[PDB]
What does this fold into?
Amino acid sequence: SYNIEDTILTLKESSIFDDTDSTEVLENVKAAEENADREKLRLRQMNKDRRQKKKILNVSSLDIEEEEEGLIIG
Amino acid sequence: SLPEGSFKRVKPQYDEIHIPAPSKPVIDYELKEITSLPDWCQEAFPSSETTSLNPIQSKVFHAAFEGDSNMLICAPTGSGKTNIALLTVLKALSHHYNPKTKKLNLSAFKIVYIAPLKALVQEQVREFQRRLAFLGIKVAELTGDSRLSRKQIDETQVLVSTPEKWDITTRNSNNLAIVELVRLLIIDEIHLLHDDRGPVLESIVARTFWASKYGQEYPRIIGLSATLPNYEDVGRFLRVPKEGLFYFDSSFRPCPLSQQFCGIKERNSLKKLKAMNDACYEKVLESINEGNQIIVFVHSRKETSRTATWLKNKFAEENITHKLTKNDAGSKQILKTEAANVLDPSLRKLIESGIGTHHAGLTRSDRSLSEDLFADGLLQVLVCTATLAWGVNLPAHTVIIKGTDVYSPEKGSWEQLSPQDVLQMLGRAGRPRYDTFGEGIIITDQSNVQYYLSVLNQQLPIESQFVSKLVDNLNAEVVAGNIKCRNDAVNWLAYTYLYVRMLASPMLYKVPDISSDGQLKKFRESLVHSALCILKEQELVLYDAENDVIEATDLGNIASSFYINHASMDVYNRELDEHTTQIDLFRIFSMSEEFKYVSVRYEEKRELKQLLEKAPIPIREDIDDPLAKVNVLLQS
Amino acid sequence: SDPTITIKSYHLWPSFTDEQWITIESQMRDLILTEYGRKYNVNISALTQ
RNA sequence: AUCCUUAUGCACGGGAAAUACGCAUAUCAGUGAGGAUUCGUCCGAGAUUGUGUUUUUGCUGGUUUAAUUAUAA
It folds into this structure.
């Protein structure tokens, strides 16, 4: 009943027992792979930049933690 | 095609096809000598080595004095063009300058020479000074780093300008007296129309015909170009009388260009690159044993240094001594004097081996040095980016073009070498003054060879890119006040170079109208509509759809004056704000569209990193983003 | 594009010859390769097979 | 001229195996090797010895950013 957004919305992937009783979301098929491919792309170009240019990242606690950070009636 | 390929060699790494040198010209003509000239014109060729003009020149020259008409020369540009332009200049000078009375009439005639590049402008200017010194003429540069003011233009007679600055000078309303005074408008390299600067030339051309009707005396227009197809359509673009058109093929070239390809059969880049280096090495080995001075073009400037390193360790592995076996004492001397003194991109060692390189990103002094050393000949091999073919006249016997894919920020993708660039790279060749013929070579992937054969035959029209520059040119013209309506706009667009090209091939350039509107009235008017919508959105000009009235705004006037692109303009429009501050000003400056082609580099990155720490004006963006690099360079 | 190419009552996709498919598959690959990059700001040409 | 049988060579297509394929200035062997039998007989070409390689022979593929230049002074 919770939404994320002439458009169609489908159920997002969720584990049966891990989900159990929890709020369920409705996302667009193209939007899910859209966001995923944007983030993972941003990771790929940073992979090629890191390995090619041999730069060491600052990162650590707060950065990696913030990387861990990453209704309709019908 | 069959005559073009005579002979083909098959090699393990690559299949090389060797095109024979072009044919020598048939003589139906007399070689025109210097003593046939009048009294003052005999110093046009102060050093007369032949005392006879080249195969191209004589006929075009006497035709040029005979008619006063718009002319076009499609030629190898074998140094033949410089003298022809000089001679037409002297004619105009004589028309305003009496044969009996030797006082030169200074205030009557004015002359303009449109040379695309600043450097080539410089070179030209020294040439014109040398040849025109006897009349007592001031030949000075109007463009860019030239920095001529309001007065010196009035003082001067002969002008040598780049297209951009000449456009901006003639666009301005106050000078129009000077524009009227110019009788002689020379356009060098009219083949530039293919490239995106060419839009400026066609706009200048349109302004010359259409904009001055109140004085209405049309100046003499002389196009000078590399040989190109659709010459007739070019004339219909300009005026050209049929007789002024002179089409000369590469058979009239001073040094016949021996065309050569290596197709590369490999696919993956790690072996493919190695195969290319092997082929280049093989060609260099064939050349240097003959005493051949050689240039190797590449895509990128970073490629140059690593290529030269590869030639040093590989070439030296084969034989170290043969590159310099002669005057090794003086070679050591001059080499250490040049390399050790002014060079600091770790390029000294390459110079020291005697395989050098030249690229944008090499110091201005170091740059001049490399040119001179390669002229003397202590440099047997010269690795280069695309700067030299475009800029500098210095030919070298063997010319290798390594690779196909160039990265253009226009697309943001790797495209093929564009024909107009390939051709001008092939232009520099065996030296017309000294050597008999040139060796051209193209290191390339075999699949695209079929394409490069044709585009290398120069069968490709000068493509009209006016679609991008239309809007800005139209805005500037409205600022001039010449267009009050859509009909005026399309009449101006009739003298535009895209107009002709549309007429020739409507579906190629996406004319939907086709059979309808032979004059493409509605197509022209539709483009004007499209332009004036976006202009009005950018508050550049006033427009109404049904009533159709045009007027220029202040922002449009600013864009006209400082020649800002329309994209840059709307970027300024939104990004500038009431509350915008010192930090945001640099950011907007960086956002200016003229920096779209700028990008950060890995050899630049260390100095960038050192800068952005101690930079006084902070940067909201970061080292990877080109905008930040731009405004930190601005701070520096 | 071509209305002369008719989907029957039986089929889903329209009936072509082979070479018509050979071109259509290139046109379909073009949308994929252009929109993947355009969305992710990636150039088409630099891509490995 | 067509059609068919056997043997051999080259070969498109389809399988199976590599505890399998070979080598010997070496010993024998249709002038009888090696077996079988219902005890009358019957089958008829390898056997020994040494050795090479044998979860492997050759070859490949993937993955681990061009140049140029524009202001009003």
Q: What stands out?
A: Chain C has one helix and no strands. Residues 43, 46, 48-49 of chain C lie near RNA strand D (CB under 10 Å from a C1'). The radius of gyration of chain C is 15 Å.
